Amino acid sequence: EVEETLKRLQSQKGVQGIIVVNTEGIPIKSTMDNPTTTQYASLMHSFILKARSTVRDIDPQNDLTFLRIRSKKNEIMVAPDKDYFLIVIQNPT
Amino acid sequence: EVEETLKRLQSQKGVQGIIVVNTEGIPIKSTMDNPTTTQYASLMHSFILKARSTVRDIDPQNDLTFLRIRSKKNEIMVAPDKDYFLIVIQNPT
Amino acid sequence: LTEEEKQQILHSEEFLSFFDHSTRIVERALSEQINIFFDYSGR
Amino acid sequence: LTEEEKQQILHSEEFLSFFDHSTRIVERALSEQINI
């Protein structure tokens, strides 16, 4: 059903790839060019660490839930949970 | 007339605080105190600096346009303008 | 020492045009107003 | 790193709420916003 999740959420337009990274930074979920996107997965691993440090240092009780980013060319979100994380890249379609 | 939109944003649903960054990580316009406006916005200024470094490392032509964070206790949108940036703090409900 | 005078730049007519762009972004972003559904979360 | 370890952790009793909130929040991001 994880491949069913892959198909159903990649059928959503704008999305160029459901490349979801774990807590370990390992490509547990990648559908695109993996040496290209594993660098970016390691980046956004370090910057999910930045965002969780941001939340837990600015506020004691707050928990990081979700992130919204508008880039120049596309619309990319970040979905963190308490144990593991998510990355996906979408265009304005 | 930024002040009339400010006045509309006073009693809007969920407004925790109304500030803006003014001098590239050094905010002046503050309806709050020194840490919550200036130090937290300078932290977030360095953090969106790291995020612009991230997306510039993906593609140096690809800069960043807009940011928003939702969490447990707050939902904060971040608009990176040219030199100064923007911070708006808001409740999730 | 951050600035000799903070007010003049912000009191102006063209630096507030960049602030008018920023409030245009604000008016673009506050219009949605949709909240997260529970679906028996518990917490 | 290995397929055995992945199909362990994927079918482990940890990713249940993780897949649930993954699908839920990605579907929650399906509502399109406009910028004109």
Side-chain angles (χ1 to χ4, degrees), chain A, chain B, chain C residues 1-38 42, chain D:
Chain A
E1 293 181 354
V2 182
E3 192 271 330
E4 178 66 27
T5 301
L6 189 153
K7 189 262 178 184
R8 185 67 177 173
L9 295 175
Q10 193 173 2
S11 65
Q12 183 175 0
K13 298 297 294 297
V15 177
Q16 292 172 356
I18 306 170
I19 307 163
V20 169
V21 71
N22 55 3
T23 304
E24 292 180 353
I26 302 300
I28 194 166
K29 174 69 172 66
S30 295
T31 186
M32 295 300 292
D33 48 355
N34 211 167
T36 300
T37 189
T38 304
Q39 179 180 2
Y40 298 156
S42 176
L43 288 174
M44 296 308 293
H45 183 273
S46 175
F47 297 106
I48 280 169
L49 180 62
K50 293 289 185 181
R52 293 178 69 89
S53 298
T54 304
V55 171
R56 300 294 172 86
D57 289 330
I58 291 173
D59 187 75
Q61 292 293 322
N62 195 1
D63 294 332
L64 180 62
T65 65
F66 189 75
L67 178 59
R68 294 286 299 278
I69 297 171
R70 182 182 295 276
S71 298
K72 295 294 288 184
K73 279 81 176 175
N74 53 6
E75 294 174 352
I76 301 169
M77 73 190 77
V78 173
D81 290 332
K82 188 173 75 174
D83 56 353
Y84 289 91
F85 308 105
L86 283 80
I87 298 294
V88 70
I89 292 95
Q90 188 177 3
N91 293 115
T93 187
Chain B
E1 290 180 352
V2 183
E3 188 176 1
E4 62 91 20
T5 304
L6 180 145
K7 189 172 289 295
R8 182 69 177 174
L9 204 144
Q10 295 302 109
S11 66
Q12 191 178 0
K13 291 175 69 69
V15 177
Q16 297 186 1
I18 174 166
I19 59 170
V20 68
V21 184
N22 200 4
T23 319
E24 198 263 333
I26 305 168
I28 298 169
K29 182 174 173 66
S30 177
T31 57
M32 295 297 169
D33 54 355
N34 206 166
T36 305
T37 302
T38 299
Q39 183 60 254
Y40 290 172
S42 179
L43 286 173
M44 288 302 296
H45 188 275
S46 178
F47 295 152
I48 192 61
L49 180 62
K50 294 296 287 184
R52 289 178 67 189
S53 299
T54 318
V55 181
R56 186 175 294 172
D57 201 1
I58 297 168
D59 193 2
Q61 296 293 321
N62 195 0
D63 293 331
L64 285 179
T65 304
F66 181 75
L67 181 67
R68 185 260 182 87
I69 301 171
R70 68 183 181 180
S71 67
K72 181 180 75 175
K73 65 185 286 186
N74 53 3
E75 293 184 353
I76 295 170
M77 58 181 69
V78 178
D81 199 358
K82 296 180 177 67
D83 197 4
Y84 67 99
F85 293 161
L86 180 141
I87 305 297
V88 169
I89 307 100
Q90 190 177 3
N91 289 108
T93 187
Chain C
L1 179 60
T2 298
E3 256 178 10
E4 15 291 357
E5 288 298 347
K6 304 180 301 300
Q7 295 183 353
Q8 191 166 177
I9 61 171
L10 192 147
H11 193 275
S12 295
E13 297 175 354
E14 187 68 28
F15 190 66
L16 290 181
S17 69
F18 297 104
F19 276 100
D20 197 3
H21 186 197
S22 73
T23 58
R24 177 74 270 174
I25 299 167
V26 168
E27 291 173 353
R28 184 62 63 193
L30 289 175
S31 65
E32 300 294 327
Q33 302 296 322
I34 307 299
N35 216 169
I36 306 168
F37 186 74
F38 293 159
Chain D
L1 291 173
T2 65
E3 298 176 354
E4 298 171 351
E5 292 172 354
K6 300 289 103 176
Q7 292 178 355
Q8 177 182 0
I9 297 168
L10 290 174
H11 298 284
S12 64
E13 293 177 352
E14 177 64 29
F15 276 171
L16 279 304
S17 66
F18 177 68
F19 286 126
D20 289 332
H21 288 285
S22 76
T23 58
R24 178 65 183 88
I25 296 167
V26 171
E27 286 181 353
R28 176 69 174 83
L30 187 145
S31 290
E32 183 68 28
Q33 67 274 14
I34 202 65
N35 53 5
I36 53 95

